[PDB]
Amino acid sequence: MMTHEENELLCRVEGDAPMGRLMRRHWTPICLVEEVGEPDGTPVKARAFGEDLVVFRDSEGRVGVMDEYCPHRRASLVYGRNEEGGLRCLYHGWKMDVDGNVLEMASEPAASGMVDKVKHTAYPTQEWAGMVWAYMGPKETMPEFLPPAWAPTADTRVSIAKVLLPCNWAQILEGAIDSAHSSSLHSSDMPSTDKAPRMQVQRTGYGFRYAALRRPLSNAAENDYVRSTVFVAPATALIPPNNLYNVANINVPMDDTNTAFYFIAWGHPSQTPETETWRKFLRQTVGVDLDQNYRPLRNEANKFWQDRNAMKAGNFTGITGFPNQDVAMWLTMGPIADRTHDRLGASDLAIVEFRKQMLDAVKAFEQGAPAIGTGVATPTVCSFQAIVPKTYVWL
Amino acid sequence: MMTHEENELLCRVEGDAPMGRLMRRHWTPICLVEEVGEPDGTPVKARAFGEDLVVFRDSEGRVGVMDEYCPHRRASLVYGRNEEGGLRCLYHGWKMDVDGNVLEMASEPDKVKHTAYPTQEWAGMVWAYMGPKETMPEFLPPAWAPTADTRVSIAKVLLPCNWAQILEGAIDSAHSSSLHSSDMVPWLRPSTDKAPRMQVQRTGYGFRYAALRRPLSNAAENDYVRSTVFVAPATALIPPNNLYNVANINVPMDDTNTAFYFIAWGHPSQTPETETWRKFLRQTVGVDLDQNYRPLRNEANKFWQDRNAMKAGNFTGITGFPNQDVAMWLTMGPIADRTHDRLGASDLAIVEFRKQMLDAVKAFEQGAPAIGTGVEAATPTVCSFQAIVPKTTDWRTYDAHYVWL
Amino acid sequence: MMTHEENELLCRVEGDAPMGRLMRRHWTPICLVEEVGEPDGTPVKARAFGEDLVVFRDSEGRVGVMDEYCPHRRASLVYGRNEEGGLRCLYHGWKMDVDGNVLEMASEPAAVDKVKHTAYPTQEWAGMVWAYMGPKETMPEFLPPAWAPTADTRVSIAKVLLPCNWAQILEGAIDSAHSSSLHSSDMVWLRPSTDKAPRMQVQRTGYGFRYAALRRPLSNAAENDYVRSTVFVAPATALIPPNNLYNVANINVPMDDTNTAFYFIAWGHPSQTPETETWRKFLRQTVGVDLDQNYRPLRNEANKFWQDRNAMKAGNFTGITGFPNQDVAMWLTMGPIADRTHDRLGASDLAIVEFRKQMLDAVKAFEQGAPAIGTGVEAATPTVCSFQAIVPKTTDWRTYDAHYVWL
Amino acid sequence: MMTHEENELLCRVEGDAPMGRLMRRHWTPICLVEEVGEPDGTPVKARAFGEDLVVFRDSEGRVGVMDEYCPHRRASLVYGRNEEGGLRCLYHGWKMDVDGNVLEMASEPAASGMVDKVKHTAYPTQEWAGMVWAYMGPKETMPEFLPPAWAPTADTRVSIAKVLLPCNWAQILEGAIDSAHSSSLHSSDMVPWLRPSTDKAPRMQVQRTGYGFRYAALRRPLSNAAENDYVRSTVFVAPATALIPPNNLYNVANINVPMDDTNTAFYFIAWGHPSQTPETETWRKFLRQTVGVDLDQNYRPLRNEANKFWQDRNAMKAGNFTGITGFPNQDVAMWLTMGPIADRTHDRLGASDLAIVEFRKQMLDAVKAFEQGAPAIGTGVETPTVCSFQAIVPKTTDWRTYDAHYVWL
Amino acid sequence: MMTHEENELLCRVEGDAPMGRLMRRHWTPICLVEEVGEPDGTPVKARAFGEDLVVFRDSEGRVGVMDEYCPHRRASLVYGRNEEGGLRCLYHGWKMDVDGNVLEMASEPAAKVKHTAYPTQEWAGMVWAYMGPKETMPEFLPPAWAPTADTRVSIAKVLLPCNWAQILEGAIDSAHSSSLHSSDMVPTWLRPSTDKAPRMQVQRTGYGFRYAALRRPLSNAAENDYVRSTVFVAPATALIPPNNLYNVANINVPMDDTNTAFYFIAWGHPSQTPETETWRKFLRQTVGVDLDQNYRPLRNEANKFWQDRNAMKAGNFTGITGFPNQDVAMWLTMGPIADRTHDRLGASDLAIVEFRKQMLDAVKAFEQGAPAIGTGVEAATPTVCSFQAIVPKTTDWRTYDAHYVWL
């Protein structure tokens, strides 16, 4: 049992919200690399922790991430001209480089100190693994960019599906680390037809790991069928792989009630599907399942496209593409799920571990501890699944 | 003159709102029987007094009405599977029967209950009881469904405003002489009198009024008397015509939304069928309303008001008499500000409603039994009427039953 | 900086807000003459300072601006029947003359005279319907504004209903620097200078202020200035530098705290000044093309104002068509009410700072009981005007003797 | 077995064609009474036998059917003004009354006797059983309007679903005399609406008459297969009418007016006792032919080839036979895919298609007979007494003997 | 120069038409495997040589291809139920098998009937059928662009509303790449040359012809040339020059006289060849974005194939996105059947000329009992491939030992 006050602490991320300041101590994904295109390419709107951002690739191929609004009079730089090593606002011709210096002011006698003085709120950025990463916490707190759990280096294929979801981050993550749901919700899609697991969790410093224990066809005398989802705090999940490639979900709070859900497949080129394969398989294709902004066309008004006939004709949910089955469940709990009223049981140990871990971490960090996960996962402490006796993937 | 405070009191239904608790002391329509369909059918979304509900018919053909959200993690049950005695949440495969019993849990070894209300099918509607369980009366018949051999045709519309203004419009004999002047024509009336003399008689369940107009002849010793019955909290028995009867009941969905049910009832040989009614009122689903019964007419489209029709001599230039009503209800805004109303002679019925329902909710707040419950409710023999009546006779005294044969 | 409270004070108009009361000390455009049409024509919804209004023209041809909501029980009179010298509500058939007298109630014995509906004195000038929306005993006689001297003038209006607060809109009209930047693909129109950083000079007046924007001209920048001069007329009019054929004015009426009716006027001699539809084509404010039937822009944040990226890499500055749509993309993205708290201004925003200083002054003064800015003997007239000329560096531009362009 | 020239004889109706003038020997439905509205009401467009017609109700309530094109310079009279006992073309203000008399020529001096001496094509008309009818034959062949087969008297409720279909009429009528199809196509819809038989293969039996033929379909009952027949009797009333087997409460009729060679007005009618017969909208709902939901304002269907008639594949995997909603819509899916004019030249017909074969024989025979100058089939001295029926009937009483009347009370 | 009649002979495929009979001597793609999917899947409508077809995979997984119209009264089998070993017509419940056999006729007693259906084969992502005389059906051999089952073959399908021949002409026309696709396959694809006007040579074979486009290489143009070799495999298949990672083929199938199914293929080693959706995305031929559910393009003459005039000013050649889409606009605007009568050809069109000659000759011969081009021991096999390579100025390209790309 949690309280309204506890729920706000965990979930809110905008402005001063403790969880926000915590999360900004980690390098965060801002948008997809496919969004910023070639040098001088079209500016792009993104949103993180309640802050509206421009992103764009300059003449030299450097990618900046900056406050969306012009330091002059707050017009949106997303309309700006991205040329000649800059991004120039349309209103008065102020030009910012990717580091947020004002290179020029078309309209102000630049033979005067306003050009040199004025810096524009801008952020360090890194391109890794198909995403633009930014560091949006305090300047000096900025760690070296250490390649994450799900991309050793870059001889790996990474295939991303992005979705902008209109609900809070914490419910979306919970759903990643929820072993039981796969046996009901995903049961027309997903070596065990076992609907009920026994849950066991072992906490670490990056987050936690948990194994879910199911009975295979028979041989459950000697056998446990184990599915180990790792939680990498604050917002990543390493989904138990398949025979071919690895699967991770990382969520980024755009604000209190919206989230950038990245669902990744990754591994050996020979074995990991290309972006458009992945997306079609997940039913998350721009132009078909998503609008040009990676928001979903499935929605509450059309009931996530549910087909009652497919349901009567055997299909469990009548919803195409497994994440969209998650999305229907997630969005219906509401913009921020009211955890106060939850009725949890043996199958939800994982969600409870996450609740505990994060509330502690934010409390800790808010009392001045180092932020959870910024300690002294990694590319070979990831997820697993095997029929392991009683008591990553590549080529 | 009302206060901003009394108007909150009269109007608000959500949460603890007094008028809320009061209303949940009657049986209430949740949705139509047509919506629920065959046993094992598609679950249905509904809303009442600011609660979200699933309605579904199970394999036995029993209808459940329950909180919309799963007792587990609050996922919408409206997506669940309705089959094999129960409704199953998609997420973790919890399954409820209609009574709220968590029959089975897919991922786990009278354990846990889910909020679920008693239900009752009657005259084309699924009723439920949302008051404290121990208060539930036995389902008497409403005053507009004698028995099962009565044809009951229902127009449902979901209107985006507060309930009270919608009812007030049912108990407002004057309006039909202006607003519906092109649709209820000297439908046909034996009077050109637009200004009816109003008279009221308070009762145990609400009240009756009369609207005494000058008939097309004999007005020396003759009134044309129209009588309407208000059945608290939110029901009006409209004067019939001489083939069938008319009734309106309004369920508040929340503080600014109402399920408006407009019924035609009587003897099947003489009462129009559902779709016929709908076409007449222009409330046909897929023509006038979307698949959830919300109008396609709205402020942006000006309820399709035809400015030429109006220069041609149609009065409102909006097709379908209730839509003409809707135009007026919705413009007063999502809760009418009765603080700023300048009422007159024709508003006597509305005034009695204003007073009675305030007394009732005040009374009820101080621990009185809710208006119209108990020994007090109306039934078949209380009714509306219309007839040419001699001025020597009191209308209070007129012995009218519902038109039939 | 400015403080949060100052911004609130300067911007909000709804209900009791001082700026609201102040602005209602001036006759206000409510809507266009062409909206109200013929005697006994369709009634028309309008909005000013957060009140909903009906405009209609009775059988006699008098135009009325009253409260939208029926005095009886509050239905909208916009649905009413406009005939026989009044507007009849559809609900119970109360009928109101333009003056707000209730002529008749179909539902009542006259045992009618009692009730008066909120109604405002009206005036028809320069293709607009005007109303005096403040305390009646303080209504001035209607004099001709600076941009419509008398009746032989052509006045061509683009009306646009912008979903943002009025002050950022006017700010955009008293800003000469932006024409070099935003409008560089458009006002590249007649301009005898390619200066981007004009020097700004102000002259406070009793009705507002004249500013001037001095650029180096194309020839003889040695001893000559290109002078463009704009007049701010409180509370929300701008007189824009004319071209050599007609004049150009902006008047903004706030419909509420976050919406403004925006009027962009071409005016001058009938045979030099474009007609209404030419003006809307040029500005891309054509109803049915660029605007819906209520004058709201079909361009919006979601469509990115139809900004065209290929057109931009092709040499077009903004990629947005219609010079004002270009303003519009800037204004609406600053937010419903612009946060001046966060501005970082330079020498170019001098006029803008004058505006904020003058108008904060005038509202503070007004809430003390000073006469409201630009009322009475102080009001600008025909003889105040904007202008563009090449002027000697040795002549004060304030002294330069300009008249509005005609012939 | 049939050839191309037989098919054109049977099917084509436009101006030239024999089948056309054979059909113009009967009164024909032109449009619903509902369409024509009030006196002075909006004019309506209709089309029969390749002729464009205006339909309007004049100031007196008299209903005219005329040619669509103004007799002046050929503008469409559908756009005209319907007032003051006439219909005035917008172009030059010529005004016609319901009998094609030119009342006025607003732009011609009445000093010119053109006014008195121009006549516009117009047909005799009749309002009956919810429909406007016109006689389109030569004037002097016009019969009296005898009350027809499926609207006995005036106190009968007649509930009409109209549907304009873009194919030739014959293949549609064929659809209505084909008792076999319902056990496949309407198999999820007439779940054994009720039928007392699980029997698909019905032994057919014909019997010529003077107006058409009565046929029956003998089916094994779920009860007393030993010595009991379940008769399902259709009547074909030439040219293009079918009295379908009425269910327990009301009678069902179909009548098809060819709009031209490749389009057909299809009227599907429920008729009987006011208390027993459903109303227009309830019927249209049932049938899924509601204007504004399943059809546009011209009674044209929204279901079409392009959208696969809203066939729902998931519904069909759920055990729904056709995956199409509304039984006529299932017929339509089939009738239209056969193409604008079905090529009977490739038909591989069988014992269950006897009905259709007899239909072909008759109309091919009666059209050549008429093409020769004999009275057209159905005309001469050849109403509601002969009807469809259905019963469990003993095995030694011939069904051509059965005394069954139209379903009333 | 060609005559109206020859053009008729070359292009028509429906019914009588000889070029119809000739083509129906080859195995023909009918539709994609993806379309029929699961056993008991949704029946698919197709169209070859002027006949409508039903395709469907049955309970066991066999794929039948048949005449669309039911043998009984000619309704569409496309609307039928595909279960339990058959496709059953909805009308009267006749049920066919993949082979044409009527297993059952619901409304007909129980106490030989056969429907037009063709031999089928699944390969390389396609359902093929043999739609010519049964006893002239050859064993199905691997086509030159999909050798074995360990190839990755990724197909884009687009139903195109013009005649097949102008579409194949477009595949064998090398000089077009340096004009139409100049913004797409630049000095994103890269070619080792800037030369637009190449010296061409043609070698006629039994199965069609090979030809070579000799561009001068960016460097060493004196003693080495850049050879790009296309292969025409009759009747309507082209093997396009590979890139360095994968091969590219185009097969066309006449749906009728004025509509072709166009299949544009990427093939090679799994580790080097794109998957379907990557292919489609790159060519902008994605179902739901560029094409409707039937693979018909959303680009068309009405919308000018989405020609972006601003991008053309920016320096994009065609302003049409997706290199095949640039092709489509040229092909379609030529008209449903291109009138070669009005063609004025030149050097660059040598291969096209060669096609017109070969195929006119092949069809004339065929009519008088010659064997159909590229059947029997004459057939192209996988040993045939297109290549690009920098080759010594005095090596005969005809003899170069080139194998299709793989590693």
Ligand code: FES
């Ligand atoms: S607001 Fe961006 S340059 Fe002025």
Ligand code: FES
């Ligand atoms: S929320 Fe319904 S079972 Fe989990």
Ligand code: FES
């Ligand atoms: S509200 Fe207008 S007359 Fe009653």
Ligand code: FES
């Ligand atoms: S064409 Fe009809 S009046 Fe002249």
Ligand code: FES
């Ligand atoms: S038409 Fe195919 S079964 Fe009768």
Ligand SMILES: [Fe+2]
């Ligand atoms: Fe999931």
Ligand SMILES: [Fe+2]
């Ligand atoms: Fe009403």
Ligand SMILES: [Fe+2]
């Ligand atoms: Fe501007």
Ligand SMILES: [Fe+2]
């Ligand atoms: Fe049928």
Ligand SMILES: [Fe+2]
């Ligand atoms: Fe090409």
